[PDB]
Amino acid sequence: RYPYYLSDITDAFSPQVLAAVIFIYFAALSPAITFGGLLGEK
């Protein structure tokens, strides 16, 4: 559908919080990167 697509143009309303979100992307979402992705083996 449209997950990140929505956070594409709305990525300017959050600058400082942007870095923060990355800190968690480094902490919690560290391993989530590879986990989850192929949702349509077709």
Query: In sequence order, what are the residues at sequence separation of 6 or more whose Cβ sits closer than 8 angstroms to the Cβ of residue 21?
Result: 14
Q: Please state how this structure was obtained.
A: NMR
Question: What is the rounded CA–CA span in Å between residue 2 and residue 26?
Answer: 24
**Can you tell me the distance from the alpha carbon of 40 to that of 19, in angstroms, rounded to the nearest whole number?**
31
Report the alpha-carbon distance of residue 37 to residue 29 in Å, rounded.
13
- Matching residue, tokens 């979402």: 29
- Please, what are the domains in the chain? 1-42 (1.10.287.570)
| C-alpha distances in Å from residue 14, one per residue of 9, 21, 40, 41 | 11, 10, 31, 34
